[PDB]
Each structure stands twice: as structure tokens, then as C-alpha cells.
Amino acid sequence: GADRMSKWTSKRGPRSFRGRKGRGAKGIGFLTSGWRFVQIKEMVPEFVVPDLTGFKLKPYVSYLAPESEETPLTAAQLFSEAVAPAIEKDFKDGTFDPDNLEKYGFEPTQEGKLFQLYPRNFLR
Amino acid sequence: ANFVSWKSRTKYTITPVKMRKSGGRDHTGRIRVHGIGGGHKQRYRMIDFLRFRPEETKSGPFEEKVIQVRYDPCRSADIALVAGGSRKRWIIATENMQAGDTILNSNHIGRMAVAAREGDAHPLGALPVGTLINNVESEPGRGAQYIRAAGTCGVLLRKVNGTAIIQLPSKRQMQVLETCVATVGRVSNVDHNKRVIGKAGRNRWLGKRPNSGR
Amino acid sequence: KARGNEYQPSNIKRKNKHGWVRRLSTPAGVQVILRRMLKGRKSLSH
Amino acid sequence: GLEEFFDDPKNWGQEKVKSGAAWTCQQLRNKSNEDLHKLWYVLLKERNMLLTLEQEAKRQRLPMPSPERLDKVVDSMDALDKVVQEREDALRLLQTGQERARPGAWRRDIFGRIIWHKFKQWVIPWHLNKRYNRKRFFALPYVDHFLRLEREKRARIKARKENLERKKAKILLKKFPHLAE
Amino acid sequence: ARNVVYPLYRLGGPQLRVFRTNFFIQLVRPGVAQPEDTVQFRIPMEMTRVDLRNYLEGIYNVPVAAVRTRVQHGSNKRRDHRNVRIKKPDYKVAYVQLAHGQ
Amino acid sequence: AYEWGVRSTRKSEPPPLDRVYEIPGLEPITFAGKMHFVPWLARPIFPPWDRGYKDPRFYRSPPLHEHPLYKDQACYIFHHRCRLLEGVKQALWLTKTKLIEGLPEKVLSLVDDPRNHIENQDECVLNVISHARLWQTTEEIPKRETYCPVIVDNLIQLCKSQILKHPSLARRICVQNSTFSATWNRESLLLQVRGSGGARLSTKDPLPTIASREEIEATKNHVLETFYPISPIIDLHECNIYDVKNDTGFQEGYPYPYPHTLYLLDKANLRPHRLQPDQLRAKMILFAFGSALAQARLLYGNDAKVLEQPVVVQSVGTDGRVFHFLVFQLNTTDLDCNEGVKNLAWVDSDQLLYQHFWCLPVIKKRVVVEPVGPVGFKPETFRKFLALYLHGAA
Amino acid sequence: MKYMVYPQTFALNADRWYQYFTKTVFLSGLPPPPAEPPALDLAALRAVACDCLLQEHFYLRRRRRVHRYEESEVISLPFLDQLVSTLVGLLSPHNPALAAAALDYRCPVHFYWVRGEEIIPRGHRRGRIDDLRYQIDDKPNNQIRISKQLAEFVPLDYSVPIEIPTIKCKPDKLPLFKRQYENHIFVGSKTADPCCYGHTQFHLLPDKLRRERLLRQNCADQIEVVFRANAIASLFAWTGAQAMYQGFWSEADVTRPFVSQAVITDGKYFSFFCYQLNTLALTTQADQNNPRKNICWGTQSKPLYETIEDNDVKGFNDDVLLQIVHFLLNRPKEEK
RNA sequence: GCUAAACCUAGCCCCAAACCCACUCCACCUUACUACCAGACAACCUUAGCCAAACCAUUUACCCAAAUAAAGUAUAGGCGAUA
RNA sequence: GCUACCUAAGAACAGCUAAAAGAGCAAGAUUUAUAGGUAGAGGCGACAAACCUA
RNA sequence: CUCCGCAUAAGCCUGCGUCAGAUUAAAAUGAACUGACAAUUAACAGCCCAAUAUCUACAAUCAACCAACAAGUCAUUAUUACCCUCACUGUCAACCCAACACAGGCAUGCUCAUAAGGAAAGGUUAAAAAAAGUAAAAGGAACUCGGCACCUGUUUACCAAAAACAUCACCUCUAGCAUCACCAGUAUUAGAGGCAGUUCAGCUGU
Ligand SMILES: [K+]
Ligand SMILES: [Mg+2]
Ligand SMILES: [Mg+2]
Ligand SMILES: [Mg+2]
Ligand SMILES: [Mg+2]
Ligand SMILES: [Mg+2]
Ligand SMILES: [Mg+2]
Ligand SMILES: [Mg+2]
Ligand SMILES: [Mg+2]
Ligand SMILES: [Mg+2]
């Protein structure tokens, strides 16, 4: 008699089932003695909203705009525009040496960084 | 959930321990012994059967005072709360055990037969020949496994070459070393057999359901 | 006197008896899931 | 304020509201990260206003004014995510050489299927994790036969589709004989 | 944000921040009579009332006194021509009370 | 000897290790690299894992011996939940005190004259009993966990109305949640008393000494009775991690440092949880002794000498219906030896305020046999209660 | 089914909604002085007030650590008990009634009443008239019950131009929730108790409503609302229960006012309220042409002290303390 | 005159040839589709009965790498059936 | 999830004779909610060779 | 009329709210069917807790007196560790399991006759037969298979009888022992068996 096809949700089942299951909201704390909930400020996502005053970009773009070819960014293109110039200058001056990759922005490891690329430890 | 034995407590205590009935089923959940089921809820009192168990620091013979003698739902005999030093424990009560009495537990074999005092625990070899004994152990330090029921008492027939011959309540000779502790006297509730159940309903209270063979 | 009312719905019983975790608990139950996957069942289990 | 959720009071009631084109990925790619961050909230407030108007139109049982505005805003925000994701993706490759942001591994499951298992974050090591260890990332021999039946089921479906395509081609030639080639 | 892994927080770690939230909300007309200081929203399932208060205050600069939410069940009664149930999606409803007597 | 804990309930023994570990120079290939178990690879051996930081909700405490306060010599602590097997007799030995049946003449004398009795005392006391046992809550029959605290509080409030007659009663306060600690040695046994629970009646002035020096010296002849084969420290918490410190319960400068009276409540609904009459009196002696000892050690230091100015502390113990009264004088702080001057304790026991209470009328054959209200009320008990309260202010 | 009315509530602007449910008009300040055509030892009362404030905060040694979320129940609650229990004893010579009064500790006060009607919106009972039922289950920290009623603050037919607030939506939007359970009318003791009249009530606001939390929740204007809502609900429930203990009800309205006083504090800030119950005819029928209104007087919360450093209380406000004494010195008028 | 009737596609079957499958994001072995705590449960072991012998009791079949032929031959078998 | 038995932890039972508590008239070898266990060469059965979702 | 009703639990999952409909019930207002729109807001409830050692003989019954037996839901301390806060989820209905003439089933609290909840008659006629109810001269079971008035426990039947099984007692049988049943038991124990009212008077459409 039970409905197998319908989605299983916290509305279904007895009181124990309904309390335990949630709707996908991320937890922001823990439960202590007496079912008291302690909210951890750091767990609560902090919205980083910028100052939009004096900002020229708007939701839409004027139709009188030169269409351009789509060129997705690649790791090579980023290297040629952000890292290649510094190495090219140093190589001419002979200052460049392999041991000093970090001078041009290379990170040997992600440990100790606030925003680590892999494994990603920051929200969108 | 599969059967888990309630007998999981590892530390001795005099506090009654909550018991779980089996209903005649083994760990497989199938009936092994028929006619077992229901009854009144019972709490287990950890009975100490190694009468001669001195305290951790102390050693040698010691004495205990009978604080209380009370009914036990888990056995036919009555039990006695005995306090010695800073430790209390549950023991089996003798026929004349009473509150306030002092009892002795010794593991010393005298050159002769020490005077037999009810409720004391001496080595079989020390006990006089032809004395009613109870709570006898097969091996030194094993703990009393025999003559533990209400009103039961074995006799020490003879002591020969470091061994003792005792008559079990079933009139069967048993031979044990002379360093095996035992308790002088009959077990409490000598009139246990006399009691009449009277009503079929009483059997259900004792946790015994109908058993039909065919 | 009642007839045809064998079903006494209980979500706890239904999940425990026929649930996903129950099926995976034994090799026979896993094969139950495999057969239903092969047949293309919309609901593999309760 | 709360009025940001609604369109310019002048526009209320107007059958249409003229709007510009959606941002393209190339246009956004020229902008800086700080500009994209500010543009996101500019687009976000516009999207919330349009979503609000769309719902009120249903409540009033009337058509939504200029519904294509919502399609444009969703296109621009999707493009903004792609442009920002590409920058992070390219940066990750250079610094770590990792294709994906989230660690994972190819695993076999209890059903014998090969799956990409995305890793979750834990405070304790896996060998001490009671719940994680209950999961079985292997299949036993009894799964082998079902894998063969599943493979043969896949082959039957593929064979039917290929056969049908060839049949349709013959029907096409029957109706259009010049297509013989 | 929704459909994104949250960086696990350990005691004493940095604050969790979301630079480009993908939460989109709808301000809606109440179906029934509400107090003057009450504003009703439809928000995503994953958005908590704490998120909504920060979301409105941070992005819209709306002082929020109280926030309450509930999960509205969407009817699954409708059947298509194949006699297959059609699911109206469940959505979350939020009730926001404006601060400062607004 | 029968061992407790059946094998089936004990943790299963580790599986037999793979034999590849036995072979020297061979590295067993394990599933540790896979990060999950597989039956066809050897089980890894994992090094003990440490979190590396502090996480309160998952904290583990160090081994007991490593604790900073761990001591090789055990200390026996008496607390509110300690139930003495020998009751008062054990308490008398532990505190090196002599027991005198009844209360002192000085205390009782205060209530001897009618001018000290409260107006309509019997009517007022009867209302207190009816309020706590019948009227206080919506429940038909209030339970001991509620009526026992209320009856004592109201009785103290009834005695507090005499501030009009005796203005000195303004110099006393009733303190809740106060705790005191006193440590002393008896026959080389380290003893401690951690006092908690009940109400502490505090006064700005010390109580007068009940017994003169002549009576204090007469105690030398008295010999502390002993119980054998029961230890004096039975039913006490044998503690190995402890601090040998003396605490009256308040920091320096408290306007009411002197513990006038200690009120102890046996407010347990279940009879087994409730203390026995003799056990409750034993708790009163130790708590009264503990409070007095804490005062003596504070004023006169940690030395073990006969006190020139003894300390008097009173205690009242009740379960809501039965009251026990105690006056304790700390004559000596030299407790290590049985011989010498001994402390004096005046104990009045098993004083019933009322025999029984009927919350509902008893009806037999549709006739009201017994009406609701206190049964067998004994106003004498309250006079003893009033006498202890008036003591030191009248 | 009835609405659970919580005197200590988190609902925004609850005081306005509670005024409608109880038909209560709220006035600022205290009631006009009682017209009338053993000195008070202020130095001894200030000392005792500071000896209770410093015992809990400083002198008393705590075995365990007191966390911020326990202060209200570990420090504030015991302080209020002693402050009341000691002032009543010290002031008993000045006010004879206190000597025979009954002092309660966290005793329940219940009041059940009907106010207004509704049309059942849904179900098999849709369209039928149903009474709007309300229940208050209060638990004041301390309360003083006397055996003789206090004097009224204004006449029974006292009227004011201030209108009673109305609501344009259902009470559920406060928010308010309905539950069905025992309907209790309780003054803190059963009817048999001779002490069936109310003197003063002492309320400690819960930690959830602490001033600090309200400030960071953008609810600074709600600080005074919490105090007012607590007083209106609690004193209405208490006086209403007292009137129903004398046989009065909606169809047999009170023939004399029923007054009571409340002191509402969070452990540092104190508020003083006076309530006069003039009518119980609150049902649509009984309240058809009923001109009587219930009156509640209240003051703005003031700090008793500013800070406590070690054993020194800095900033003790005698005005707040004297106001507590004035409430405790109110006595039932004696007969000729 | 109603009810109806009529239809040609959807796809499917058998071969041949080629060795197939599958990580947007998020969720999913706990009550699957559930962000976030000291694991420990671990897989391996003759297929059976029976088509037939007109019953049934030993006895017959379902795989191991080249179509054909040797050959239904050698051989096995209540020397029966049959293999 | 029926039913039989059992386990865990719950719950219900007016009046009347009323000593005795008892299917007396109208508190028990009673009834009952919840979760769990025992499975077909079997289980369970105050044994009808009954019952174990016809 | 009330047989209930309201609420909770369990189950169920939008399933008589608004608007519209050409759909639907006997019914071209109603609508539980279709389309669109709206809705149930936490205080109630669910969702809990740092470690190690240690503590926990005294039922309940108005718990007092007098009592018992089947022997019982209710408790800590020591030291270490810990400064933070109100998230998440259930909340609608004329509703479930059934049966398809409610045939029936369904836990708890409160109300104890309702302040809540409901409608036995589509209209007519007033034949038979049939069902139920009521009244009935004289008689009062006549004529009819048969009217009405060695303990205990289940069973078919029911006023019931009977037998069967169970079982107190009784009897024989096997067993000298412990860490999963028996049993945390020990021959005064455990298990397996056997146990051999009529007549009369009175009343009734029988
Ligand atoms: K439903
Ligand atoms: Mg909610
Ligand atoms: Mg709650
Ligand atoms: Mg509801
Ligand atoms: Mg009605
Ligand atoms: Mg009808
Ligand atoms: Mg008809
Ligand atoms: Mg007749
Ligand atoms: Mg005849
Ligand atoms: Mg006759």
C-alpha cells in the first residue's frame, strides 16, 4: 500500500523520521546537552557584497556592440600573459634561475594558503 | 536486532542489575528450552560465591557482619548482605543467618578440627568430619557451585591424604582437595519444598508458560 | 471478523524490512537489487 | 531597499520593457575579477526582480512583461560563472596540475559498476570512520553474471538502434531515388 | 550557495565566505492577511533563515528583525496522459519582519 | 572464582594477522592505498592517530595517574550522596564527637515562654503543611520533590516573621548553592567532607558556645564506640585525585561568614533513593562538623589544637514529614588521636511534624471517614524548629 | 484548540497584540498616588541589596565554571530569590501584611479565557462560528500572595481616551500557535488556600530575550516591548485568575477591580508595572457593549547597577531600589 | 441512420560486421539518493531433482577452442533404456 | 505490518458484594499500542494437526 | 439523531480554500474530477550530551499505621576538558487498513452528554410474498429434533453442555555442572514424561 515512487522527504514517517531528515540546508552548528543548539559564527556563510556606487556596468549590454570571436581561457594563455613577461626579462638579464620559480608566482604547495586551489577549500 | 546476553557487567556490585528474559530462546532466536516465558520483572543481585575473598590490600582470614537477610527472586535460597572492612557483597544465607551476626572466612587448616560454627567458611580439611556443609567448590578458588539451593546440605564423610569426601544432596560421593573452602550449615529456606503453588496463575508469575509436547 | 486488512502500514517496519540498507546487508539482497536494475525497475527498493 | 525587488515604477503596467543584449563570455572575459564580482550582484538583483515579476504575473493571471529579459539575465550570469570558472580552472592547472577542484577516485561499487567517487571532507581518518567503512567499494563474484547480462542488454539496444538507422536510410532512398549517390 | 560543497570548518578556522551567492529569491504577495511589517519571500530549499537575514541585509540593505520559514508541499496528485503523477515542486516560504518600525 | 562478563559480550579478539608479516624482508601489499577495505588484500596496520589540537566535544582525558593532583595516599570524601552503613555511630567516630540525646537547655529555653511563640502558631504551621502537601500545584497529590523543599522554605519564612520582636534576626540571610570543604585526619586516615545541597542560614555573628569548659573536659572519659569488622571509612568515596584544601564556601569579606544553620532535604520520590533516618543524621553530623571545621581552620589556622573558642553549628534534616535536629560544637581540631577532648553533638531525632496527610477525603460506604488535611499534627516539633532559628538572636 | 500565550515572548511588538487579547490599555508611568488626607532605613536596604548582588557575582564560590548561557539561571535567578526573600523580612515591620503573606518560588500561574470569534476556514466544520480561546501558563520567579485584597488604583468605571490596539490579521501571525490541553485557572495555589489575592510578582527574563541578543538581532526597539508584553500577559493572567477565584467570569463580571504589581528584570535592568483588572467580559457576547477597559501602568527599564568589579558594585541606583520597596510596602486597606 | 468500419507507420526479428558502457554542479550503503567523528562484518566449499527406462532403486543432459570425415565406429551400460 | 509464540521498554481497566479477589454481578493464565526475534527438510503451537499476509 | 465529538499518536500526502470549467454525484447550487492560484510561520514536537575512573542493599500502592509477594521504571562522586548560542525538520484536509448495503478494524488524553458532531423519508401508492417491530380474545409447550426462567485455566459451542488441551498437587525418568539457551542457575535445582438435576409451579404468537 505504501507509495514507493514518491520522493522520500522529512514530511513522511513518524516523529523520529521527520525530525532527522532535512531539506539540504547546511548545518551551522551542533547540539549540546538538553537539545540546545550552539550556532558557530564561522560556519554561517558570510556574504561578501561589494560597493556598487559609481559602477558603470549594468545588467544588459547595448545592442550596438562589435561581436567578437569566442576564445576560452587556457592555462597556456594565462601563463603567456601573466608569467612569461617576467621570465623573459630575467632570462635576458641572466637573473632567471630554475630554483626561483616562486618569484614569478609559482606555489610549490597549497598548504598554508587561505584559498587553496586543490583540494578547493573556498566557496564560490 | 540479534540476541545479546544481558550478562555483560564486568565489575562486581551489590546494586540489583536489570535482567533480560530469554523466553527459552538461544542466540539464534529459536526455542531451545520450552515452557519459559513472561513472568514478573526481576533484577539480578550479584551473589559472591568465593566466600574467602579478602580485600585487595588485606590478606588472610577476615570477618564480616550480616547487615541484612532478604528474599532473592533469582534463586530458591535467601541471600545475605555482609559488610567487612570497606566492602559489601551478597552471599548465600544459612538456615539461621540473621542480621547483625558476625561470620568468619578463613583459609587456614588447623592441626585439629575447629569448632563448627554456622555461616563460617573454612577449608574442607579444617572442618570436622561429619559436619553439614554447603556452597562447596570442586577446586581451590573455583567458587561454590554445589549445595547452593534452599535447604540443601552436604556432609563431610572423611578426609584422606589431603583430600575430602563429601556427600552431595543427591547422596553421591564427591572427592575434592582439602584446601577447598566450604560453608558450615544448611542453606536458608529449609521449608522451600513445603510451599504449594496452589494456582496455575502463579506459574505464569514465575516465568513458566504452558508447554505442550503433543 | 475483518477481512483483507493484513496491511498495517508502518514506515519504520517498511524501511527496516525492505529498505535499501537491508537489501545491501546480505548477498541475496544485493542480487535482488541487481535483478531489478536489470529489469529496469523504477523503484529498486523501498 | 525592498523597492529593488520591483521594476522602475514607470514600467509597471507597460506591455513591454525594452532591454539590451545579454553579456557574452568574450565581453566578460575582458573584465577584471573585481568587476565581475560587482557585475554578479548587479545581475543578481535584476534576476531577483524579474523572478518576482514573473511570479506576480502568475498570481495576477496575466502575461509577464518582456519575459525574454529573464532569459538574458540567466544567460549573462551563466556566462559570468563560466568566465570566472575558467580563470580558476586555468590557475589550478598551473599551480597544481589538477583537472578537478574536488578530489575523487575511480571505484568499483557493490554492484560491480565502475563509478567516479567524489570525496567528502572528514575530521577523522578513513580507517577510523565507522560509517565510511560500512560502504563496500568492491563487488563479489556473484555480481559477474549480472554484469554480463547488463552488457548484453546494452548490446541488444545498440544493435537495434544501428539496424533501425540503416532501415531508415533505405526508406529514404525508396522515397527519393535521386539520393543514391 | 546551493549545489556546492561547503569547506569543512574546524574549531578556530577562518570565517566561511560566499563571494558570488547563487541564491535567488522572489518577493511574493501574501495569500492571506499579514502584519504591516511582514514581507513574504519564496527562497531555495537550502537557504536558511540566517542566510536570508544576511542576504537581505548584505545585498539589499534591508534591516531585518525576524525571519521564519516553512516548507510548502507541492501537489503530486496530477496525472499526465500516461497516468503518471506530475509533481508540483516543493518550495520554501520565508516571512521577514522589518526592523525599526518599517 | 566466577568472572563477570560473558565472552559473547566482550569485544571480539583481533583477527589473525596475515602471514606475510611473519616473513622477514617482505612488505605485505595492503589496501591502505585504496583507502577502503577489500577482502583480497592484507589488512593494513595503522599507526595510532592523534587529532593534533584541542576539540572540547571530542576531548579525551589523560591517564588517571598522570593527573597533576593524583596522590599515592587515598583520601576518603564524604559528600551529599554518601550513605553510611553504621549511620550515626560511624559519624561520631569520624568526627571524634560525643552524642547527647535531646537539644541543649539554652536552645529549648528560648521557646519555653509564650512571648516567643508566633501568633496562631498552630494555625499558621497547619497552613504551611496544607500548602505544601495539597494547595501548591495543580497536581492532585504533590510529590516529595516539591513539597519537601516548599515546607522547609515556608517554615523558615514563618520563623522569619519574628523580626518585629527580635531585631537581631535582620542580621541573618539564607544562602542556596553554597559548598564547603574540610580535610582532617583520623587515626592516620585522610578524610574530607565536601558539603553541597540544602540551604545555609548565615549570620553576621558567631553562635554562643552551648557547653562550658567543664562539660568539654568531661568528654575525656568518654570512649568513642567502635564497630568491627566494619571500617570507619566504609561507604565513603575513596579518592586518589584530590586537593587537600579548606573552603568555607565564600571569599574573604562575605558579610555573613558564620554558618548559623544547615538545612538538609531528603527530597527523593522513591524510597530507596531517600536516606534512612540514621543515615540522614550521620550526614547532618558530618556536614555540621565540616562547616564548623572550615570555620575553625580559617580563624585559627591549620594547626591541630584544642580550640579556646569552640565553634557551634546547627543542622536540620527532614524528608518533608520527619525532622531531625542537631547542635554541633567543635571543641577540638586535634582529631588524629581518639584520646583527648572530643566534640559535642546534641541530637533530637525522629521528630514528627505530622503523622500523615490526606489529599483526598477517605470515603467508606459513601461516608467521609477522614477529612483532607494533616493527621496527628504535633506542634512540639515546630517549637524545636523555632528554637534553633531563634538561637543566637533572642 | 486554544492559543498558547507566552508572557515572555520573542514575537515582535507582542505587547500590542497582547493588549487586544486582554482588552488592556497601557499607560506610561505608575498609577496616581493613593490619596490620603518607624523610619525607612535606606542605608540598610541598600546594603542588603548589594549583599545579594555581590554574593552571587563574587563572594559565593562556584564549584564549576559558569558559562554565559547559564548566568541567567545560575547568578540572576538566585539573586532575585534572595533580594525578594530578604526585603520582605526587612520591610515586614513597616508592612504588617508581609508578615502573613505567602512567598512563592517559580510557582505556576494559569489563566484561560475566550476573546473574540472566528469562522472555521477549512474542513468539515468550515463556516461554523468558533470561539477564540487563549491560555497563559506563566511561571514568575517570585510572587507574594496575601489573604486580603489590595486597594484599587482607579475606579471600576475609570475611562481613558487611549484606544486599545487592534489587529488586521489572525493572531497566528504574531506568531501564535494553537494546542489543546488542560484549561487551567490558577493563581499559584489551589482555591482552598486562604491566600488567594496577589500582591507583587517578580519576573526574570530568559536568556533568549537578553538585551545583548536583541541588539544584534536589529531589535533595539523591542527591548521595552519584551518588558511590557511580560507584564500585560502575566498580570492579566494573575488578576484574572484571582477574579475567577472569587466567582467572577465573563457573564458575571467583577464588581470591584482586581489589582496586582510586577517587577520585571533581566538581572540588571528593572521595570515596574501595575495592573488593574476591571472586566472579564471579553467574549463577543459579553463584550458587545462593555465600556470597561483593563489598565496596565509601566515604567521604562532602568539599571539597578552599572558594573560589578570584584567586591564593589559601581553605580547602584537607589531610585530603582526604592521603587521595589514602594511596591512591597503596599498594603490592603483595613476596615473601620 | 447510428454504433462502427477501413489505413501504415511506430518499431521489432533474424544475420553479418565490429570486442560495449558510463566523473556538468550537488546528493546517494544511515530509514540510499541524508555536507561534517576512534573502524574492524567480511568473499572462496561436487548443482540438485529430473526429462527416459512407459514403475522405480545403478543408469540419461546441459562447457572447455577446426566446418568435414573417421563414426553413430571403438567403447560404456539393470550390457536394458541409453550413452 | 496477518497470525502463533517470544524479547525490550510502555499503556488501559466504572460501580456493585467488596474479609477473599474474583471473567461474582457487571486487576487477570487479562487486554492493548510500539519496535524487535523465530522461515518452509522450517518456524510456532494451553495440539484444531491449527497457524505462518489466499 | 447523537452511534458521538475535539485533540494527540500512527497512517496518509494536498485529497469539498479561491477562480474557472464544456468534467462530475440522482442532481443541466454542490463538487471530493480537471486547469490556474493560494497555503501549514515555534514557544508544541522531533533532532541531544567531552573523557577516565568511581557510585548506585531499603519497591510501588494518597506511603503514614496494619501488611505482604509475583520482589519491583526512576539517584552519583573525583580530577581533567569546555566562554556559545536559538539552526534544521513536522505543522494543510472532509484523511488511515479495509469492505465495496460499516461488512468491519483502529492506540492515548479529554468531554460523560455534549458548547462538539449529524439527517433515518427522490415522489407517490398503501396489493401479495418477504424482513423487523408492536398489540392480541380463550388456552398456555398442547403440535413440533429440542421453548423461556483433581484445583482451576484456554478451546469448539455457547444458557451451555461435552470432550480436548493446559495446569496446582501427585508420580516416575535423566543430569554432579558455569561465561550466548537451560543459567549469570547447582539435586528443596534443572529438563523430559504420565497423571481417569428433574418433576411441579409460572410465563410466553412456539
Ligand atoms: K492524505
Ligand atoms: Mg518550523
Ligand atoms: Mg521546544
Ligand atoms: Mg493541525
Ligand atoms: Mg451541532
Ligand atoms: Mg436520507
Ligand atoms: Mg422510495
Ligand atoms: Mg394471547
Ligand atoms: Mg411435546
Ligand atoms: Mg409448564
Residue numbers in the entry:
A (entry chain 9): 14 to 137
B (entry chain D): 61 to 274
C (entry chain 2): 47 to 92
D (entry chain Y): 63 to 243
E (entry chain U): 2 to 103
F (entry chain 5): 30 to 423
G (entry chain s): 89 to 125, 135 to 433
How is this structure described in the published paper?
Mitoribosomes are essential for the synthesis and maintenance of bioenergetic proteins. Here we use cryo-electron microscopy to determine a series of the small mitoribosomal subunit (SSU) intermediates in complex with auxiliary factors, revealing a sequential assembly mechanism. In this study, we determined sequential cryo-electron microscopy (cryo-EM) structures of stable assembly intermediates and initiation complexes at 2.8–3.2 Å resolution that involve six factors: RBFA, TFB1M, METTL15, mtIF3, mS37 and mtIF2. In conclusion, the model for the SSU progression through the assembly pathway includes a sequence of binding factors as an integrated network, with RBFA serving as a regulator through its allosteric control mechanism, which was not reported in a bacterial counterpart.
To explore how the SSU progresses through the mitoribosomal assembly pathway after maturation of TFB1M, we reasoned that an inhibition of the corresponding LSU assembly would allow the SSU to proceed towards later stages up to the subunit joining. The structural analysis of the SSU assembly intermediates obtained from the MRM3-knockout model suggests that disruption of the LSU assembly affects maturation of SSUs. To strengthen the structural data, we performed metabolic labelling of the nascent polypeptides in the MRM3-knockout cells and gradient analysis, which detected no mitochondrial translation or monosome formation.
